[PDB]
Amino acid sequence: MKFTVEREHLLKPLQQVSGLPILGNLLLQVADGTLSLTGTDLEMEMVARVALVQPHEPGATTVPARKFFDICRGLPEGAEIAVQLEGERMLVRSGRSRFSLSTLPAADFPNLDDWQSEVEFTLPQATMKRLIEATQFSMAHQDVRYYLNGMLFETEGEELRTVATDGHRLAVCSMPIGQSLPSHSVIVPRKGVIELMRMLDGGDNPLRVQIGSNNIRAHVGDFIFTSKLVDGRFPDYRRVLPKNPDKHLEAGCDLLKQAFARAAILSNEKFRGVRLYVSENQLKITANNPEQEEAEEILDVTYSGAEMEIGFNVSYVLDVLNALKCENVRMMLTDSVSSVQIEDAASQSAAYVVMPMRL
Amino acid sequence: MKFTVEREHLLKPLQQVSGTLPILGNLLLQVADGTLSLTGTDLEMEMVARVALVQPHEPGATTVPARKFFDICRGLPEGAEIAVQLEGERMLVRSGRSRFSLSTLPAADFPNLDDWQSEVEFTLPQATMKRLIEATQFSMAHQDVRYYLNGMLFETEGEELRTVATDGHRLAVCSMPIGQSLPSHSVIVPRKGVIELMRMLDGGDNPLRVQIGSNNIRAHVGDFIFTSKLVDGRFPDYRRVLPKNPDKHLEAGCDLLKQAFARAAILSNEKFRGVRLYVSENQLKITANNPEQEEAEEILDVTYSGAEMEIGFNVSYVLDVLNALKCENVRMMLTDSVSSVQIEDAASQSAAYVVMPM
Numbered sequence: 001m002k003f004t005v006e007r008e009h010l011l012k013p014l015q016q017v018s019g020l021p022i023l024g025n026l027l028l029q030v031a032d033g034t035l036s037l038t039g040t041d042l043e044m045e046m047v048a049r050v051a052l053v054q055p056h057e058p059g060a061t062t063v064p065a066r067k068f069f070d071i072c073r074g075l076p077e078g079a080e081i082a083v084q085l086e087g088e089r090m091l092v093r094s095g096r097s098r099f100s101l102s103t104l105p106a107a108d109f110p111n112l113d114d115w116q117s118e119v120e121f122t123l124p125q126a127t128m129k130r131l132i133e134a135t136q137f138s139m140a141h142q143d144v145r146y147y148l149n150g151m152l153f154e155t156e157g158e159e160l161r162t163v164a165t166d167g168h169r170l171a172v173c174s175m176p177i178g179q180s181l182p183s184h185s186v187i188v189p190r191k192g193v194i195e196l197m198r199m200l201d202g203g204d205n206p207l208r209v210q211i212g213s214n215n216i217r218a219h220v221g222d223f224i225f226t227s228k229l230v231d232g233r234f235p236d237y238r239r240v241l242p243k244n245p246d247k248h249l250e251a252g253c254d255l256l257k258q259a260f261a262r263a264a265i266l267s268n269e270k271f272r273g274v275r276l277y278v279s280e281n282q283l284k285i286t287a288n289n290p291e292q293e294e295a296e297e298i299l300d301v302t303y304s305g306a307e308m309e310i311g312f313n314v315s316y317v318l319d320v321l322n323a324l325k326c327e328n329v330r331m332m333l334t335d336s337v338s339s340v341q342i343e344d345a346a347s348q349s350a351a352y353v354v355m356p357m358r359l
Numbered sequence: 360m361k362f363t364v365e366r367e368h369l370l371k372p373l374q375q376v377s378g379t380l381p382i383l384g385n386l387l388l389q390v391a392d393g394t395l396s397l398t399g400t401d402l403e404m405e406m407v408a409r410v411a412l413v414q415p416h417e418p419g420a421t422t423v424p425a426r427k428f429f430d431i432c433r434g435l436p437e438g439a440e441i442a443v444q445l446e447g448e449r450m451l452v453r454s455g456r457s458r459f460s461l462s463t464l465p466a467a468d469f470p471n472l473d474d475w476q477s478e479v480e481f482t483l484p485q486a487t488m489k490r491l492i493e494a495t496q497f498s499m500a501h502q503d504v505r506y507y508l509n510g511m512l513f514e515t516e517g518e519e520l521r522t523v524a525t526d527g528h529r530l531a532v533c534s535m536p537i538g539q540s541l542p543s544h545s546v547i548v549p550r551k552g553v554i555e556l557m558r559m560l561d562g563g564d565n566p567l568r569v570q571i572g573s574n575n576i577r578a579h580v581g582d583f584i585f586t587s588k589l590v591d592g593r594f595p596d597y598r599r600v601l602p603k604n605p606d607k608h609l610e611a612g613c614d615l616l617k618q619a620f621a622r623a624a625i626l627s628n629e630k631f632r633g634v635r636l637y638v639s640e641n642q643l644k645i646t647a648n649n650p651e652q653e654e655a656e657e658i659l660d661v662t663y664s665g666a667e668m669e670i671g672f673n674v675s676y677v678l679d680v681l682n683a684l685k686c687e688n689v690r691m692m693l694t695d696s697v698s699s700v701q702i703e704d705a706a707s708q709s710a711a712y713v714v715m716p717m
């Protein structure tokens with residue numbers, strides 16, 4: 001096995017394939033004019049292809065991922081990196097820098113089980129990026145309900161939808177993708193969502209998604225990502241969206257966010273409850289803590305409904321306002337014993353639900 | 360106690376004073392004559408910020424949670440006027456239609472550092488102190504049982520102020536002229552004091568006034584006064600650590616040398632971090648290997664016309680120096696395989712670095 005490749009042609013591939021010792025190595029394969037690099041953690045896998053325009057010789061080995069990445073990154077910009085197998089070592093040469101790395105046999109590099117694609121679609125990368133970003137923050141972390149440690153991907157009609165919830169707050173985003181789809185849904189593990197997201201530069205290469213019974217695959221240009229799905233049953237987001245919230249408050253996102261952020265300073269550190277009092281075109285936010293410190297914020301907003309009060313966890317609300325990254329926000333209220341739904345005031349494509357607190 | 364001050368006049372002061380006994384988490388606020396004073400302390404050191412009060416005010420003192428008050432002021436919008444008043448045992452903070460009520464602890468409970476007398480004094484540009492500290496800070500020990508090494512020596516000699524830092528394995532020294540006839544004197548400033556002192560030099564034309572007592576150092580810049588306790592004990596003599604006659608002189612590009620070491624370091628021992636240097640006529644070779652028998656080799660062109668020699672080093676120590684240096688070329692000054700190396704900017708003798716061989 002031998003190849004010589006420009007440093008910069010290896011850097012993006014190496015970042016994508018980087019995260020038993022062999023799981024800490026990358027499989028390198030020279031075949032039919034192409035260098036393929038594979039990383040895996042047994043739950044998921046990334047394969048990056050690099051075209052080889054300089055002389056090369058076929059073969060395959062595995063090499064420590066972090067050391068090989070760090071050597072390539074540490075070489076000077078535009079360096080040519082000559083790689084050859086020599087006995088049990090992998091030699092890396094560029095200028096008068098030489099490195100001998102240990103290897104493990106390509107034969108021992110683990111593969112995901114073979115599987116069949118059942119559902120497939122193509123969409124712009126920017127659309128997948130939007131879907132994931134809109135909701136990623138609401139996924140559970142290492143919860144006993146293992147099926148919340150990931151993101152639902154649901155096809156229906158011509159829409160792809162993502163749902164994330166940690167059992168307390170929920171995020172949902174739907175986008176039309178211009179293809180008739182089966183009604184189907186799957187759960188992608190947390191780490192898979194994150195790796196998928198990192199693969200997307202949002203650029204001009206179409207993203208092709210293939211879904212099997214127990215696997216998902218995403219293909220963009222020179223990169224192919226494969227993950228196991230979470231084998232479990234996800235909650236129905238339709239049941240948590242409030243029935244008929246008829247009290248809509250609209251305000252500038254940044255003004256609302258800064259008012260909540262100040263008030264939060266004097267909220268309970270553990271449960272983070274703040275109270276809202278809504279009246280004719282006015283919002284008052286209050287917060288207090290066990291030491292009886294108090295905050296109050298009054299803002300002009302757009303609101304015409306009945307007067308009401310509601311409490312909620314300000315961290316959950318701030319998470320939403322931070323995810324939204326839009327000029328104006330709509331808070332869709334019902335009463336003091338019901339959830340609130342929050343949206344970009346200009347778009348229904350993403351919706352967030354936060355539960356009421358009694359304070 | 361009442362004052363109203365523009366947000367922009369409070370943020371920097373609050374940052375400067377904010378850095379289990381609860382009162383150490385509070386700031387002392389004092390309105391007296393034309394001035395709001397803000398003090399923060401941890402019993403070892405103290406920062407005092409003065410703010411001129413041009414708007415109506417009323418005298419008095421209290422203490423308030425530092426982080427909460429800072430976070431409130433910072434979170435208010437650009438240009439906010441911040442009206443403050445003590446009401447009972449609460450401090451009220453108002454701006455626009457934002458209102459906050461903070462807990463207080465009595466000003467009478469706020470600890471003072473003991474009074475002391477100034478014995479040595481001098482003034483110097485902020486930039487000179489920045490230079491002195493940044494040149495050496497990285498070489499201080501962290502939690503060494505030789506407590507005198509967890510800090511920085513500040514020495515006056517002739518008209519020079521000098522800093523020295525060492526952890527017993529590598530050493531940094533930097534000396535700068537300050538144009539005043541000084542007594543010969545040394546003190547050790549605790550590492551936390553060094554960090555806080557450094558942080559107060561941000562970062563214009565106000566000069567620094569330094570006062571040194573038997574057990575304290577104070578620094579005055581602009582409207583800020585920093586005071587620290589000193590560290591007892593017998594600091595090593597940098598003149599003993601500097602090689603006596605390191606007459607083998609190698610010159611190389613700083614960034615070239617640094618990146619060669621940084622690559623070699625990848626295949627060095629993860630704990631001991633050892634690399635080898637082979638110096639020969641106008642050439643340097645760096646090698647590294649680890650317990651898995653992985654190997655790195657770097658060869659560089661340098662300017663060297665002395666005898667051949669080899670020497671081993673902790674590469675982290677060398678990288679630390681090269682990253683501190685900020686210059687085009689470096690001079691490495693060698694003695695033999697079992698003696699320290701001295702490293703300097705090729706163009707300036709104002710700082711010197713010494714690394715022990717391994």
Ligand SMILES: O=C(O)c1ccc(-c2ccc(F)cc2)cc1
Pocket residue numbers: 505525526527528529530594595600699713714715
């Ligand atoms: O124990 C000490 O005080 C002590 C102080 C400094 C050194 C030392 C020796 C050689 C160096 F290159 C740096 C530092 C050793 C020991």
Ligand SMILES: [Ca+2]
Pocket residue numbers: 004005006009053054
């Ligand atoms: Ca190439």
Ligand SMILES: [Ca+2]
Pocket residue numbers: 017018019039040041044045046
């Ligand atoms: Ca992987």
Ligand SMILES: [Ca+2]
Pocket residue numbers: 172173174348349350351
């Ligand atoms: Ca939706």
Ligand SMILES: [Ca+2]
Pocket residue numbers: 294295296458459460
């Ligand atoms: Ca209030």
Ligand SMILES: [Ca+2]
Pocket residue numbers: 363364365368413414
């Ligand atoms: Ca003012």
Ligand SMILES: [Ca+2]
Pocket residue numbers: 376377378399400401404405406
């Ligand atoms: Ca302090």
Ligand SMILES: [Ca+2]
Pocket residue numbers: 532533534708709710711
């Ligand atoms: Ca000097």
Ligand SMILES: [Ca+2]
Pocket residue numbers: 098099100654655656
């Ligand atoms: Ca070699």
Ligand SMILES: [Ca+2]
Pocket residue numbers: 697698
């Ligand atoms: Ca000797």
Ligand SMILES: [Cl-]
Pocket residue numbers: 267268273274275286287288289359
């Ligand atoms: Cl509250």
